[PDB]
Amino acid sequence: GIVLFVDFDYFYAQVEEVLNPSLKGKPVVVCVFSGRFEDSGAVATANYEARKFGVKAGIPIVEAKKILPNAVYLPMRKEVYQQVSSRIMNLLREYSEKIEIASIDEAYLDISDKVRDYREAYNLGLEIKNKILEKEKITVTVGISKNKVFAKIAADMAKPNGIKVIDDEEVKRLIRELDIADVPGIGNITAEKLKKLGINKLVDTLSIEFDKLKGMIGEAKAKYLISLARDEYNEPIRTRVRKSIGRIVTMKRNSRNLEEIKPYLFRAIEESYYKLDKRIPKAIHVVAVTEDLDIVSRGRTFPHGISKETAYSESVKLLQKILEEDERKIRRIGVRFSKFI
DNA sequence: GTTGGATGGTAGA
DNA sequence: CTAACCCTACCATCCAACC
Ligand SMILES: Nc1nc2c(ncn2[C@H]2C[C@H](O)[C@@H](COP(=O)(O)OP(=O)(O)OP(=O)(O)O)O2)c(=O)[nH]1
Numbered sequence: 001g002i003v004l005f006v007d008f009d010y011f012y013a014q015v016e017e018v019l020n021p022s023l024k025g026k027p028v029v030v031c032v033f034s035g036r037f038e039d040s041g042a043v044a045t046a047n048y049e050a051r052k053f054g055v056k057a058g059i060p061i062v063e064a065k066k067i068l069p070n071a072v073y074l075p076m077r078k079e080v081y082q083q084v085s086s087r088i089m090n091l092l093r094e095y096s097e098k099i100e101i102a103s104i105d106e107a108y109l110d111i112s113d114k115v116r117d118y119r120e121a122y123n124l125g126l127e128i129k130n131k132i133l134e135k136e137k138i139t140v141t142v143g144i145s146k147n148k149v150f151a152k153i154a155a156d157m158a159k160p161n162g163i164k165v166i167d168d169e170e171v172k173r174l175i176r177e178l179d180i181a182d183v184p185g186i187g188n189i190t191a192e193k194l195k196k197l198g199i200n201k202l203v204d205t206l207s208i209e210f211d212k213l214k215g216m217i218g219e220a221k222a223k224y225l226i227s228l229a230r231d232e233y234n235e236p237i238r239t240r241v242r243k244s245i246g247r248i249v250t251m252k253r254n255s256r257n258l259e260e261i262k263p264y265l266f267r268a269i270e271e272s273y274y275k276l277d278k279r280i281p282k283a284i285h286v287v288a289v290t291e292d293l294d295i296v297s298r299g300r301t302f303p304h305g306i307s308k309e310t311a312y313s314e315s316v317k318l319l320q321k322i323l324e325e326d327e328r329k330i331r332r333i334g335v336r337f338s339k340f341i
Numbered sequence: 342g343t344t345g346g347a348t349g350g351t352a353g354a
Numbered sequence: 355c356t357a358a359c360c361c362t363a364c365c366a367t368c369c370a371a372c373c
Pocket residue numbers: 007008009010011012013032043044045046057058104105159160354359360
């Protein structure tokens with residue numbers, strides 16, 4: 001079993017660089033402009049030049065400009081990056097129809113039947129990087145291993161523009177030596193819970209009673225970690241099927257007023273109902289980010305498919321339900337459809 | 342017991 | 355308006371309806 005994983009380098013900003021090659025070699029910051037004030041919103045991503053100075057995904061545009069005023073600030077153009085991504089995913093598909101598109105910028109290929117061994121896998125890696133460079137001028141990192149988890153880890157170790165194999169031997173070694181916080185799926189909350197226990201390595205999860213582990217981090221994560229430590233992990237590459245599709249938007253200002261909020265919710269419903277594209281949902285959820293950034297939602301599952309009209313009607317109800325039960329003002333409002341027929 | 346719906350938490354893009 | 359956007363996957367918990 002051999003998995004090749006592809007993850008595009010500083011994606012949104014690299015696309016902008018390809019579109020406008022004069023930007024290459026200099027700082028580039030792609031931004032989500034909330035419209036609340038002069039330069040409100042967050043950085044979606046930045047090129048390596050900008051990251052040198054602490055500008056990265058997630059920080060507020062004004063914070064980025066405080067540390068890099070001279071940089072080039074471009075507004076996120078999601079549709080453009082999705083079109084470049086699709087062209088890339090289809091090139092990848094020529095290397096293996098057995099492909100799992102995991103996100104806007106990354107994909108797992110099962111290549112067990114394209115290559116005999118890791119050295120051939122590595123070579124196909126080199127070919128992939130070249131095709132994507134010839135055809136779309138986008139550099140990418142490649143990670144190759146026996147499974148998804150370690151292929152992802154491998155690419156994390158190779159960024160940017162890299163290529164890493166983690167073979168059966170180094171998987172053994174990493175199980176013993178890799179900080180467990182570097183395992184995909186282990187964020188801040190879990191990592192702090194593991195350290196309290198004294199679990200620092202995947203191998204540690206084997207020297208602890210299951211129920212005390214499951215008691216601290218939940219069953220599923222614990223099962224997953226043990227699986228990895230035993231080297232018995234093997235979740236197959238599967239064709240991506242979207243389980244939910246939604247839209248969320250930021251308001252010019254915070255409100256509790258239904259009439260002040262409706263235009264945003266309706267903007268988001270229209271945009272959502274359009275991304276559905278022949279998919280028919282049975283559940284709708286109205287999602288509200290509050291004053292203090294706490295996320296709050298109200299939903300309904302119907303026994304049947306929701307028409308756009310039903311969606312209009314029910315979301316307004318749901319929104320009112322939020323207002324009725326949470327006494328805080330709202331700052332972002334959206335809607336998410338799920339349970340496709 | 343099982344299934345699944347409502348709602349929130351965690352993670353990562 | 356004074357910093358914090360966008361989108362999706364998965365799981366846990368507290369439930370109720372089932373039989
Ligand atoms: N709006 C928004 N978009 C994000 C965020 N994080 C990532 N993205 C988008 C923009 C990125 O270019 C794209 C891929 O994200 P990645 O995590 O892979 O990092 P990126 O590709 O930018 O460079 P990376 O591989 O480190 O070199 O997804 C975020 O917090 N907000």
